[PDB]
Every structure is written in C-alpha cells, then in structure tokens.
C-alpha cells in the first residue's frame, strides 16, 4: 500500500531505524509546520529528504496529506 498513511508509517520506521527519538521528532515536526527549521542528524535529515524533497528551500506544507499523516503517526507513537 502507498497511501499517505503507509508512507508516514515508513517515515516513522526509518526514523527509528536511524536512532531518532520520536518524542523529539514530534516536537521538531510540529515546529517545522509552524515554519521553524528542524535540527536533525544527517541520518534524520536523509529520512526526511526521501519524503519531503523540497523541505530545505521550501519548508513543509501542514495541509499536505503526508504532513497530516506524519503528524498523526508521530502523535500515536508518542502516546
Ligand atoms: Cl504520500
Ligand atoms: Cl548522506
Ligand atoms: Cl517518491
Ligand atoms: Cl499528548
Ligand atoms: Na511530500
């Protein structure tokens, strides 16, 4: 399956593979959607670039299906 939800789950999977702290990523991403750059490891950055290719010059659109799905997935994993 390749909808926004399985894709967001893949992001979370890759983040944990990369040693990320999901609580931290959740906070970082919430701030990204507000417009603040994330402080990421090279590994964490590379995960995000696989899924949000224009992130560095353009930020991430909080209304995009994938950003919504990732917001949801990070919240659910962080409960
Ligand atoms: Cl998608
Ligand atoms: Cl690299
Ligand atoms: Cl792609
Ligand atoms: Cl909460
Ligand atoms: Na995207």
Q: What would your notes on this structure say?
A:
The chain has a single domain, classed as Monooxygenase (Up-down Bundle), CATH 1.20.1280.110. It has five helices and no strands. It starts with a helix and ends with a helix. 68% of the residues lie in helices and 0% in strands. It is globular, with a radius of gyration of 11 Å. With 79 residues, the protein is an all-alpha fold. The longest helix is centred in the N-terminal third of the chain and has 14 residues, at 4-17. Bound molecules: chloride ion (4 copies) and sodium ion.
CATH class: Mainly Alpha
Report the principal-axis shape.
Answer: globular
What's the quaternary structure here? Answer: monomer
CATH structural architecture: Up-down Bundle
Sheet of most strands = none
How large is the radius of gyration? 11 Å
> What is the succession of H and E elements?
HHHHH
Give the beta-strand count.
0
Q: How many angstroms does the end-to-end distance come to?
A: 25 Å
PDB class: signaling protein
Keywords: type III effector, PSI-Biology, mcsg, helical bundle
Assembly: monomeric
Entry title: Structure of the Pto-binding domain of HopPmaL generated by limited thermolysin digestion
Brief characterization of the structure:
The protein is built from five helices and no strands.
Which keywords apply here?
binds chloride ion; monomer; 79 residues; Monooxygenase; mainly alpha; binds sodium ion
């Amino acid at each position: 399956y390749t909808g926004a939800v399985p894709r967001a789950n893949r992001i979370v999977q890759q983040l944990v593979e990369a040693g990320a702290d999901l609580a931290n990523i959740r906070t970082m991403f919430r701030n990204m959607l507000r417009g603040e750059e994330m402080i990421l490891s090279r590994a964490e950055q590379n995960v995000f670039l696989q899924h949000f290719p224009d992130m560095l010059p353009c930020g991430i659109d909080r209304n995009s299906e994938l950003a919504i799905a990732l917001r949801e997935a990070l919240r659910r994993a962080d409960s």
